[PDB]
Amino acid sequence: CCAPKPDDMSKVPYYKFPSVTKLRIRPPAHALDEAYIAKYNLAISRMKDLDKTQPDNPIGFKQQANIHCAYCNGGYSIDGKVLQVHNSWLFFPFHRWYLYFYERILGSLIDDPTFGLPFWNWDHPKGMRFPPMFDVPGTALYDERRGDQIHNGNFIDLGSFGDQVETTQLQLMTNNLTLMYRQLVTNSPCPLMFFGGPYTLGSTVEAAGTVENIPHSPVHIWVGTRRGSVLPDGKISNGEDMGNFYSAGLDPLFYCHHSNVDRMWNEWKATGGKRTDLQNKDWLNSEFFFYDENGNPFKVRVRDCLDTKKMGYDYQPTATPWRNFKPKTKASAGKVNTGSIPPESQVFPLAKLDKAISFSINRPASSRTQQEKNAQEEVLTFNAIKYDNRDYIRFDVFLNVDNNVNANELDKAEFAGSYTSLPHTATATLRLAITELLEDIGLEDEDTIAVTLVPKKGDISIGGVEIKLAD
């Protein structure tokens, strides 16, 4: 994490886009033509060469990896404030700018002014396998520090928590696309839920948005080696490369994953409405620091990365079949007797979520008008999720079911969302937008509903649970 930086950010100029905007198309990583794979490998190979020939050059492979490591570790400050780009509303714009310069570097090393950084299309069934171009040993895209959950033609598990898949292939694909639907539609109806919130003061509660939680974290977990296992070099793994935030940038696939995370921002806004960029001036005027492809230092602003076409790139149009994955069936017919389960006040603070537990919770308002629903989002909020930051964590949330719910079947109207964590006491919050579920299950006139938590991995405590109306 020895990242290069100017000591005095006040002397660093602000970036200016080139006067001639040369539009790059980022293509899906699967089924890429061999000629594109060849030049991607050449660019990465030349980037890695700089590790040896020019180890201090900021555009080299290891140094670009160090930039991400140092950002995740708090090693960059501008205007006297540390730049917090994880578990915060800076997550998307930081990575957009990071990849913008990374893509310009790749193109510059092969004299290709329109080189497009491919995206791992893990939201589409054709892209849910590990992308073949990255699994050719002896090429620059390859990384031996990956798990072997990724081969055999296995589909990615977008809710992975480091263990093997436990369902059928059909159900795993179904769960993946249901998670996409929940994370890109249901649970991100509004900007702060998609992007996350300010993670400024402490207030050390993590404030990730939807995508940063899921599917972003499970991809890291699925690709990286298994912590504790023997690496191909002989040493014990801490999740290297992708499974550890110190080393993730050392895997070329890291950038291709983030290309799709960046694409999610575009796809989320594509339906308009309330899914727009954050309008808060504090967010828009937040700054980051980067080196351009000529090794020159610059500051950039969030407000200047909102439109990728203005930055000179866009994504190859690609179907998003998860938009059709609103569950059609209910796991449980009828309505749960909320008098036969403990109220939230009796369960929380919950010292350990060791097994499935159900409880009743009060809604602040019932029979809400459509104008009310437009104005304020109904959000089920899990406060003070606490765990060891060295642990893998996952739990799922269902409405209107009981402790016997089959949590391997996410394609149900009752499935609300999930929380996961990638090992860095942590403290976190989970917010779920429940209006769509209350409508589908027929609970809109209820003052009290049943909630069921199902732990899947890790030792988890939860301080409290409340339903609030958020603007």
Side-chain angles (χ1 to χ4, degrees), residues 1 3-199 202 205-232 234 237-423 425-470:
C1 233
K5 62 176 173 178
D7 199 37
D8 186 358
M9 297 292 333
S10 64
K11 302 292 177 270
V12 167
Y14 287 99
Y15 184 69
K16 302 150 186 68
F17 290 103
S19 55
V20 173
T21 303
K22 295 191 191 182
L23 180 66
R24 307 166 186 258
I25 300 309
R26 303 191 170 172
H30 61 276
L32 224 35
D33 189 86
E34 292 299 334
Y36 205 135
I37 303 178
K39 65 186 194 170
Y40 193 4
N41 273 115
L42 184 57
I44 293 288
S45 186
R46 290 175 172 176
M47 217 177 159
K48 294 188 161 166
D49 288 343
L50 290 176
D51 295 356
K52 300 311 175 209
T53 60
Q54 307 189 28
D56 52 342
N57 189 329
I59 79 174
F61 183 86
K62 175 95 185 312
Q63 292 286 184
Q64 288 282 308
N66 289 334
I67 294 160
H68 189 261
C69 178
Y71 263 103
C72 289
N73 194 241
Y76 285 103
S77 286
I78 300 178
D79 290 353
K81 40 95 185 188
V82 172
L83 306 190
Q84 262 298 321
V85 301
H86 288 105
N87 299 308
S88 94
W89 60 4
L90 296 187
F91 172 78
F92 273 108
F94 162 80
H95 283 95
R96 179 161 281 182
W97 271 117
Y98 180 40
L99 263 59
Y100 169 83
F101 288 112
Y102 178 83
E103 182 181 56
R104 289 186 63 83
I105 290 166
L106 290 182
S108 73
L109 291 165
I110 55 165
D111 292 313
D112 176 14
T114 55
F115 178 84
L117 177 65
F119 63 96
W120 185 2
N121 194 191
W122 38 242
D123 60 305
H124 184 109
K126 302 278 186 75
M128 285 177 178
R129 297 189 169 85
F130 192 86
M133 71 190 319
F134 289 89
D135 195 31
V136 186
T139 60
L141 301 185
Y142 188 78
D143 190 352
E144 68 180 344
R145 302 188 164 208
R146 298 172 179 147
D148 289 43
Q149 257 202 126
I150 66 172
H151 306 302
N152 306 86
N154 284 336
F155 289 135
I156 191 172
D157 174 4
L158 293 181
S160 179
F161 46 89
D163 289 351
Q164 279 180 118
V165 163
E166 74 307 358
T167 68
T168 63
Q169 287 303 297
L170 289 186
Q171 189 64 53
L172 166 73
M173 170 71 63
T174 295
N175 288 346
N176 285 351
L177 294 163
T178 302
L179 286 173
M180 290 294 317
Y181 178 78
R182 283 290 188 243
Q183 291 302 275
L184 267 291
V185 183
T186 308
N187 284 323
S188 50
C190 63
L192 286 174
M193 296 193 69
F194 180 74
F195 292 106
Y199 187 18
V205 185
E206 302 170 15
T210 56
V211 166
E212 186 176 3
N213 165 41
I214 296 171
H216 173 60
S217 299
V219 181
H220 277 278
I221 300 164
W222 191 74
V223 177
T225 55
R226 185 199 345 124
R227 174 173 82 177
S229 67
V230 181
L231 292 174
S237 163
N238 207 322
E240 294 88 346
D241 276 336
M242 283 276 290
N244 186 297
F245 269 173
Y246 280 58
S247 54
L250 292 173
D251 189 335
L253 185 51
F254 168 84
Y255 307 90
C256 181
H257 165 63
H258 268 282
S259 187
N260 205 45
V261 176
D262 188 77
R263 180 179 162 257
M264 290 305 90
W265 182 359
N266 278 15
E267 288 296 332
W268 175 81
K269 284 199 297 201
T271 53
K274 309 314 299 171
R275 295 182 176 93
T276 57
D277 295 312
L278 294 173
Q279 298 183 288
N280 189 316
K281 204 172 226 169
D282 288 342
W283 183 77
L284 291 164
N285 290 159
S286 302
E287 292 178 11
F288 318 108
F289 161 76
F290 296 99
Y291 285 101
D292 79 345
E293 76 270 10
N294 308 287
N296 293 311
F298 291 103
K299 294 190 288 192
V300 292
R301 294 164 186 98
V302 166
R303 81 198 186 201
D304 291 314
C305 73
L306 306 183
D307 172 23
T308 63
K309 294 174 182 302
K310 284 185 180 178
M311 314 181 86
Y313 76 93
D314 205 346
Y315 292 92
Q316 175 181 305
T318 303
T320 43
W322 47 263
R323 295 185 190 274
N324 302 321
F325 266 71
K326 170 194 195 78
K328 298 196 214 280
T329 69
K330 296 199 215 173
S332 188
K335 293 158 60 175
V336 168
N337 175 9
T338 56
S340 71
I341 55 181
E344 183 273 352
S345 70
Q346 292 194 184
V347 169
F348 301 89
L350 177 62
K352 186 196 218 310
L353 181 66
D354 69 306
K355 63 202 176 286
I357 184 168
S358 304
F359 57 94
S360 67
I361 186 166
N362 292 129
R363 293 179 67 217
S366 61
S367 314
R368 298 182 66 220
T369 73
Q370 197 59 38
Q371 170 273 349
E372 288 167 30
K373 296 199 243 183
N374 294 341
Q376 294 190 115
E377 201 66 32
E378 181 159 9
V379 174
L380 175 67
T381 304
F382 294 82
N383 295 119
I385 303 171
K386 289 184 175 170
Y387 51 87
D388 190 314
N389 58 26
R390 308 172 247 117
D391 299 12
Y392 295 90
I393 297 300
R394 187 180 166 185
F395 67 92
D396 294 327
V397 179
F398 298 79
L399 306 192
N400 195 239
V401 301
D402 56 35
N403 287 338
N404 288 324
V405 62
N406 181 352
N408 290 318
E409 289 176 333
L410 307 181
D411 55 319
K412 299 299 166 171
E414 296 95 329
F415 172 59
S418 314
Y419 179 83
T420 199
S421 188
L422 187 107
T425 290
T427 303
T429 309
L430 176 67
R431 308 169 74 188
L432 300 178
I434 62 168
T435 295
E436 180 177 359
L437 286 71
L438 304 173
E439 298 175 335
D440 291 355
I441 305 172
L443 298 170
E444 281 193 282
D445 297 318
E446 302 302 312
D447 292 316
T448 304
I449 59 170
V451 177
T452 295
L453 303 184
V454 185
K456 287 182 156 162
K457 192 69 170 187
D459 180 356
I460 307 152
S461 72
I462 296 171
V465 180
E466 67 195 5
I467 295 167
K468 286 212 167 286
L469 302 183

